[PDB]
Enzyme design. Structure first.
Site, mmCIF file in Angstrom:
data_model
loop_
_atom_site.group_PDB
_atom_site.id
_atom_site.type_symbol
_atom_site.label_atom_id
_atom_site.label_comp_id
_atom_site.label_asym_id
_atom_site.label_seq_id
_atom_site.Cartn_x
_atom_site.Cartn_y
_atom_site.Cartn_z
ATOM 1 C CG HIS A 365 42.928 40.174 31.070
ATOM 2 N ND1 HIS A 365 41.063 39.907 32.557
ATOM 3 C CD2 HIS A 365 42.810 39.392 29.919
ATOM 4 C CE1 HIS A 365 40.816 38.489 31.036
ATOM 5 N NE2 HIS A 365 41.686 38.579 30.460
ATOM 6 C CE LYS A 556 43.216 47.232 45.515
ATOM 7 N NZ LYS A 556 41.498 45.490 45.095
ATOM 8 N NE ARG A 557 50.813 39.476 43.768
ATOM 9 C CZ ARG A 557 50.964 38.367 43.218
ATOM 10 N NH1 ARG A 557 50.824 37.482 42.799
ATOM 11 N NH2 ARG A 557 52.773 38.293 42.925
ATOM 12 C CE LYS A 562 46.342 44.790 42.179
ATOM 13 N NZ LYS A 562 45.005 44.187 41.387
ATOM 14 C CB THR A 664 37.333 40.328 40.572
ATOM 15 O OG1 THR A 664 38.650 39.798 40.699
ATOM 16 C CG2 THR A 664 36.870 40.365 38.766
ATOM 17 C CE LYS A 668 36.879 38.206 44.435
ATOM 18 N NZ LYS A 668 38.566 37.750 44.786
HETATM 19 C C1 LIG Z 1 47.767 40.478 32.956
HETATM 20 O O1 LIG Z 1 46.503 41.077 33.336
HETATM 21 C C2 LIG Z 1 45.772 41.200 34.082
HETATM 22 O O2 LIG Z 1 45.769 40.795 35.192
HETATM 23 N N1 LIG Z 1 44.523 41.748 34.505
HETATM 24 C C3 LIG Z 1 44.044 42.027 35.911
HETATM 25 O O3 LIG Z 1 42.284 41.485 35.057
HETATM 26 C C4 LIG Z 1 41.431 41.064 35.821
HETATM 27 C C5 LIG Z 1 40.853 40.422 35.301
HETATM 28 O O4 LIG Z 1 40.104 40.795 34.497
HETATM 29 C C6 LIG Z 1 41.502 42.550 36.064
HETATM 30 O O5 LIG Z 1 39.483 42.638 36.994
HETATM 31 C C7 LIG Z 1 42.044 43.265 36.878
HETATM 32 O O6 LIG Z 1 41.494 44.882 37.099
HETATM 33 C C8 LIG Z 1 44.102 43.685 35.799
HETATM 34 O O7 LIG Z 1 44.958 43.863 36.572
HETATM 35 C C1 LIG Z 2 39.252 37.659 43.583
HETATM 36 C C2 LIG Z 2 40.734 37.864 44.378
HETATM 37 C C3 LIG Z 2 41.944 38.872 43.853
HETATM 38 C C4 LIG Z 2 41.925 39.877 42.316
HETATM 39 O O1 LIG Z 2 41.290 41.119 43.187
HETATM 40 P P1 LIG Z 2 41.782 42.845 42.926
HETATM 41 O O2 LIG Z 2 41.299 43.693 44.051
HETATM 42 O O3 LIG Z 2 40.800 42.861 41.473
HETATM 43 O O4 LIG Z 2 42.811 42.768 42.221
HETATM 44 C C5 LIG Z 2 42.882 38.629 43.703
HETATM 45 N N1 LIG Z 2 43.124 37.728 44.871
HETATM 46 C C6 LIG Z 2 42.684 36.518 45.231
HETATM 47 C C7 LIG Z 2 42.920 36.063 45.380
HETATM 48 C C8 LIG Z 2 41.125 37.198 45.021
HETATM 49 O O5 LIG Z 2 39.984 36.136 45.929
#
Ligand SMILES: COC(=O)N[C@@H]1O[C@H](CO)[C@@H](O)[C@H](O)[C@H]1O
Ligand SMILES: *Cc1c(COP(=O)(O)O)cnc(C)c1O
Ligand SMILES: COC(=O)N[C@@H]1O[C@H](CO)[C@@H](O)[C@H](O)[C@H]1O
Ligand SMILES: *Cc1c(COP(=O)(O)O)cnc(C)c1O
Lengths: 830, 830
Positions: A365, A556-557, A562, A664, A668
């Site tokens: 990942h 996102k985090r 990012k 992901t 969304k």
């Molecule tokens: C430990 O690395 C992760 O948490 N990887 C994360 O996993 C999710 C699910 O595949 C990916 O969409 C993100 O781009 C990645 O940062």
């Molecule tokens: C889908 C989701 C994530 C993943 O977001 P990315 O923009 O792919 O890093 C993280 N946190 C929450 C609460 C989500 O629903």
């Protein structure tokens, strides 16, 4: 009301009485003292009733038919609320809505009372949840296995612009969905030592921790299939954790039980960051050891625990079992499966290895180094002595394979070793997974290619057949039907409902791209979604926004990769331009940035402070008016995601090319009518490829450009020198323009940006704002904006987790998905 | 089948389907995988359903009518199993028996699966439980308040003749009876400091621990009254227990929550012994602080939280509230009630004191010094600063009262002080309770007199009106109808059923003392009880006994004052006499000794080893045959008590005169057809007085004889010198006759017996064996033995806890008991 199912006469009546049964008998309350929380529980229990019947027949079914079982091991399962989702998958939404209405209650108000099941950090955890929903919907005999943390991801609080963490006591009022199964408790060993005697090694003098399972049902979409998510809880044995006598104190002995039980107490709040703590390693072995015993027990029964060739022949193990490793967290499953097979079942090494490799599969990942798991040998040495011996033996035979394949390539040998020499020896968990799995996959096309070209190049050359790709996806149910019923309805009005479990059908929406009614409708729901969010904002957080502006959101985090900082630079730019020509028209925008920072990530927490700092200035400048608002979305989590995404116009996916494995959230937003401004990173590439680059806002360096720059050497000063607007911003930060009382408050950020920016924020600045101008231009043309939106929505089908799972199933697990309705839920009591 | 109620046609049918409902919907199991434990739970839930309706109307009733409320504060509630008891009090026993029979299950086998609610040590804890059952049966608006320990009294294991303690994880599989009430959580403070500002003192900078209540229903006997037992659980706040920032670790902060929650983790396993640990003091304030807030909240609503004189006038507090202190454990309720009234409600001291004294009552349960609570001031000083100030102020004004009453009596002043000077200053909790309560009572006539004559003499002279007596009792329901249905049936055949809630009616049995049928019957049930126990013994513990012998049993906690050692001396004597004249006839006996020793009580654990040691020799001597067996009853607890007592012939209540406050086991044996051999101690005096001394086996020193001996000086050597049989035993112990491998193993016991016997075991030896000869003589005459038994049973009426509670109610609480059936349970949903 919508296609949330039928509000049948008999069933609404039936629901109501059961709602009352539970309020009385289960909650032991009477209408006169019942609070919304009580009402939520009565309903939850009523809904839960409808899937136990199905849950029992599903599990019984798999016992009769005995198909190949899929085991998804993950240390994270970001579930979120489960009331609505359960109503949706059981076609109960309208009936419940009706019934609760007649009971004089607002279902929506009750749904907000449910606490989120935050047993995850972000992307990785949520993927596991979407996968579970897809595996159930595709009729697979799948089991999600994990840890039942009593404290999930911390709740985020912003105090004085700073993030404050506070324990997430999600079980405080109870969890109506889980079913404790104390009768299936298993023992797990730690420490001890290895004895080599006559016929085999023996793991001896170990400390025992008990693993108590808790089952949570996972209902498929309208197919009567209800799979199981089993979460393990740590419990102390009552013997030795008291019985190891000879002074210490009886009271103290009992209080010390909360030492073995701490294993499942809290989730590590890190996202894409490795922390080598003993507690973490303990959690990793705990979920692996317990799960495997459960896997083998089930296998021993199958149809072998009756007859078959008769002789516990594990030769068919791989034909009945498949365990998927969500990253390297459950990597110990490999050496543990060997331990059991070799040490306990007494299989020869080679037969045991063949079986192990054939049943295990690994999913990578991330490619960032600080996220890679490399465990110090002294830790494995003390905690899991026999496993270390097994790893060394695995390594020995693997390297021998390499030497034989590449004779004389001595550097290759050290590079591929599962053991890393240096300061302290470490074990490269990733190398272990590759060696002991028959398939390794990336989570997006570009990410998968990078693996073969870079990080695992040597491994790819050795066994090219192992490497594959499986682009991530999301579940249309929670991420469309659940959070955006309005959009789902208008879509269904035109193309039906079959797309909820066949997202590819969304393409038929292309033919309405010029439909005047549709364009108006798509535009209407988005407007309604924006109004509802703008309201929620003042309801629960308080301080107004403008629903007519462009909703620019990045959720996102918080990470350096990012680039929330890049987003920040743009925001400040917009501000500075307005302050330069106040009476010039500009498209209004409400930029929303939300996300959690790991507690020990100083920089990430510094960025959160910057964001709020910018808002302090921008949101109170009278010259700006309502043309620009900067808002930090507090405690971003699944339930919050379900609210913002449907209300977003612009989705920010601006990571440095080559750093975001897939992402992901991007998907969304695409499925919910938002346009994407982003870099050619992760799944962004496949999304633009699916919607046509003309309908996407791509900018910045491609992966190649990044490497070119690294050869050359990245010098931020250059950009600072040639771009006045950029210079102006940096000097505003450096002088305290955004931090009056503490002028040097952001020196770490500035210093980092100019001297150690691992993600070259400045390199993409120019192309980013230029591109941002292009989206503002298009926003000024409602009709065309919405038409481009229809192009994205109608083309997001490929990103459903049903597609991903169908691929894992066929190309890795060797099972065939099926959309066959299980034989009704109907009573039955044998 | 018996008078366990009616097995109605409609209700047996109704029970069965609900049993199935729960098995399916609640347990999520199907008949094909359900185990006895599952079946037990289905039933438990089915039975629990029948009293929620009643539980809700009872509580609602007390809200409407608003009677004076009785609050029983105790740190112990020895409940035991609650399935059967609930069936009995609801007249559900036969119906459930029938229904489960038709479902093809053995109810009795299912009942054995229920874990005991061992939140008590012995007598004191069990009294609280019998009281609760009586208060419900007498229709009092009573609430039992305590702590919900997750680990109750340890389970006892005998390894190599030694006691091994192991955690009692009674909640492991869940508790179907309790109802968590997280919505009523209250905060409790600790530490901090006191600020004296303008208008009053302020308790500041305190650490907060949250108190979460759990309600358990307490059904009255067939009157539709279901009262509540509220147990508090410690929980950490999620803020400060995480929010007190500035480095330490986020993970560590969350793991450290199990520091505030340790408060309710385990019960202190001491019986009649004071341990001054901080954790104990924390538990004592925790239950007090939380309970009081609940008491006042309820009061603030009453009919004052509507109108009345209008003005929170606490003048009527005592008219609406009564809190009973079970010993000094909840003694802090007094200074806490003052704190709230004075500090928070702002009442003047004197008005607050008047209210406090008028609502509080104290019950003393022991006179031995090592059991008296004397807390070091430095502990109260650190943990509860304001409470210490209040105690000093209470002391100041009390002593002033004394000085005024006894001018010049300077020694009296220091003697009565709540504060004790010396090595370390301490607070005499007993003195505090006497001063702040309007009534103080003993638990037996002689115990109460000793208080006035000795321990609290000065207090009695000051306020003679405060002192009373309330002889303990036991509940006929659990202690007769539940554990001995056979005896209850034959009694009912003659005098009806009205005696179950009116035990005095047992006297009518006197007129059957010469009835030939009855004598045969009484003798028959006892024979059946002995056969069933003799079986259970080989079933669960394994190694035969003879059901024809005299069942000599002594079951209670192991103590020096209880004199299990005296029992031992007799046993060894019997052995030695047999070995002297092998072919002489002697009445066979199976002497059963059981009980738990506190973990830190060395002597008590040494005695347990002696008992088993004796059995090792005696039980394997071929010359003895089946004439003498010595058995140590393992893990003695309520559920075990319900099995032995009904099967006992001789009950041993041999404590040194003046040491056993009352005792309750004695009463249990009397009501179940056993004859009593004992000293004139505690309630033994009132029992002999009730049955006639001719029908009792009394021996040994009376209280006066003990004192005479103390004036003279107790010299054990004298007895050793003049009694050869006694000498012989001591030399057998001293030489290793009972411990071959370890000859000096019992040197501590011998040494203690000869040089520091605080309970003069030797002084009562001669009269004890002489008396034992008399019971053997009578046992040889079945007809007369049984006739004497009928004399005891028919005269035990006075010892029902209904009588005791009726007395507390009228003479202390000021409420009138009522045997009025509450208006049915009937549905209703307002
Ligand atoms: C430990 O690395 C992760 O948490 N990887 C994360 O996993 C999710 C699910 O595949 C990916 O969409 C993100 O781009 C990645 O940062
Ligand atoms: C889908 C989701 C994530 C993943 O977001 P990315 O923009 O792919 O890093 C993280 N946190 C929450 C609460 C989500 O629903
Ligand atoms: C703290 O002292 C006690 O535990 N006292 C015990 O209480 C019970 C109940 O009143 C009495 O019957 C016993 O004789 C006494 O030892
Ligand atoms: C009644 C009871 C007690 C009290 O026994 P005494 O002989 O009065 O000390 C102690 N333990 C149990 C289990 C009881 O039932």
């Amino acid at each position: 009301i919508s296609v949330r199912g039928l509000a049948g006469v008999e069933n609404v009546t039936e629901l109501k009485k059961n709602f009352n049964r539970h309020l009385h008998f289960t909650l032991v309350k009477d209408r006169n003292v019942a609070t919304p929380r009580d009402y939520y529980f009565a309903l939850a229990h009523t809904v839960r009733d409808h899937l136990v019947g199905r849950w029992i027949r599903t599990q019984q079914h798999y016992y009769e038919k005995d198909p190949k079982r899929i085991y998804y091991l993950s240390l994270e399962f970001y579930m979120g609320r489960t009331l609505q989702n359960t109503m949706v998958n059981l076609a109960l939404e309208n009936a419940c809505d009706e019934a609760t209405y007649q009971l004089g209650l607002d279902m929506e108000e009750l749904e907000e009372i449910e606490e989120d099941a935050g047993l995850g950090n972000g992307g990785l955890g949520r993927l596991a949840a979407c996968f579970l929903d897809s595996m159930a919907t595709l009729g697979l005999a799948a089991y999600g296995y994990g840890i039942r943390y009593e404290f999930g991801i911390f709740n985020q609080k912003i105090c004085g612009g700073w993030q404050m963490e506070e324990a997430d006591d999600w079980l405080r009022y109870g969890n109506p969905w889980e079913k404790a199964r104390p009768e299936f408790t298993l023992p797990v060993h730690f420490y001890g030592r290895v004895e080599h005697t006559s016929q085999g090694a023996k793991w001896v003098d170990t400390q025992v921790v008990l693993a108590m399972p808790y089952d949570t049902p996972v209902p498929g979409y309208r197919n009567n299939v209800v799979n199981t998510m089993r979460l393990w809880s740590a419990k102390a044995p009552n013997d030795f954790n008291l019985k190891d006598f000879n002074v210490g104190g009886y009271i103290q002995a009992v209080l010390d039980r909360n030492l073995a039980e701490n294993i499942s107490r809290v989730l590590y709040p890190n996202d894409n960051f490795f922390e080598g703590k003993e507690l973490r390693l303990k959690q990793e072995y705990f979920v692996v050891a317990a799960t495997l015993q459960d896997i083998i027990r089930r296998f021993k029964s199958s149809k072998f625990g009756c007859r078959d060739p008769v002789r516990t022949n594990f030769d068919a193990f791989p034909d009945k079992v498949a365990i998927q490793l969500n990253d390297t967290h459950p990597s110990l499953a490999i050496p543990e499966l060997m331990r059991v097979l070799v040490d306990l079942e007494r299989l020869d090494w080679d037969k045991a290895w063949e079986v192990t490799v054939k049943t295990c599969a690994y999913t990578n990942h991330t490619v960032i180094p600080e996220a890679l798991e490399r465990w110090p040998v002294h830790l494995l040495e003390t905690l899991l002595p026999r496993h270390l011996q097994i790893i060394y033996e695995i390594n020995q035979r693997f390297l021998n394979r390499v030497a034989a394949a590449f004779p004389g390539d001595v550097d290759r040998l050290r590079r591929m070793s599962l053991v890393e020499e240096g300061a302290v020896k470490r074990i490269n968990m990733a190398h272990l997974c590759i060696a002991g799995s028959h398939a390794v996959n990336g989570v997006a096309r570009i990410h998968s290619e990078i693996l073969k070209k870079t990080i695992f190049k040597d491994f790819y050359e050795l066994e090219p057949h192992k490497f594959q790709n499986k682009t991530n996806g999301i579940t249309p149910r929670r991420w469309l039907v659940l959070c955006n019923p309005g959009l789902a309805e208008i879509i269904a009005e035109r193309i039906g409902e079959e797309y909820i479990s066949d997202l590819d059908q969304l393409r038929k929406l292309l033919s309405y791209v010029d439909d005047e009614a549709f364009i108006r409708d798509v535009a209407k729901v988005k407007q309604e979604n924006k109004l509802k969010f703008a309201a929620y904002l003042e309801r629960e957080y308080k301080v107004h926004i403008n629903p007519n502006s462009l909703f620019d959101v990045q959720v996102k985090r918080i990470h350096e990769y990012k680039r929330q900082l890049l987003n920040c630079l743009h925001v400040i730019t917009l501000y500075n331009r307005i302050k330069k020509e106040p009476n010039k028209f500009v498209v209004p925008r409400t930029v929303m940035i939300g996300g959690k920072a790991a507690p020990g990530y100083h920089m990430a927490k510094m960025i959160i402070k910057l964001i709020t700092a910018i808002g302090d200035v921008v949101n109170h400048d009278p010259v700006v008016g309502d043309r620009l608002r900067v808002i930090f979305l507090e405690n971003y989590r699944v339930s919050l995601a379900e609210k913002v995404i449907p209300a977003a116009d612009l989705s920010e996916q601006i990571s440095t090319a080559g750093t975001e494995a897939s992402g992901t959230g991007n998907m969304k937003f695409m499925l919910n009518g938002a346009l994407t401004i982003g870099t050619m990173d992760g799944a962004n590439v496949e999304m633009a490829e699916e919607a046509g680059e003309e309908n996407f806002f791509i900018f910045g360096m491609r992966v190649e450009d990044v490497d070119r720059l690294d050869q050359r050497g990245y010098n931020a000063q250059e950009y600072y020198d040639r771009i006045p607007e950029l210079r102006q911003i940096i000097e505003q930060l450096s002088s305290g323009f955004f931090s009056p009382k503490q002028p040097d408050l952001f020196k770490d950020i500035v210093n980092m940006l100019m001297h150690h920016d691992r993600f070259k924020v400045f390199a993409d600045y120019e192309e980013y704002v230029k591109c941002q101008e292009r989206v503002s231009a298009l926003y000024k043309n409602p009709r065309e904006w919405t038409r481009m939106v229809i192009r994205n929505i109608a083309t997001s089908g490929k990103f459903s987790s049903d597609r991903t799972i169908a691929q894992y199933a066929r190309e890795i697990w060797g099972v065939e998905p099926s959309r066959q309705r299980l034989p009704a839920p109907d009573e039955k009591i044998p």
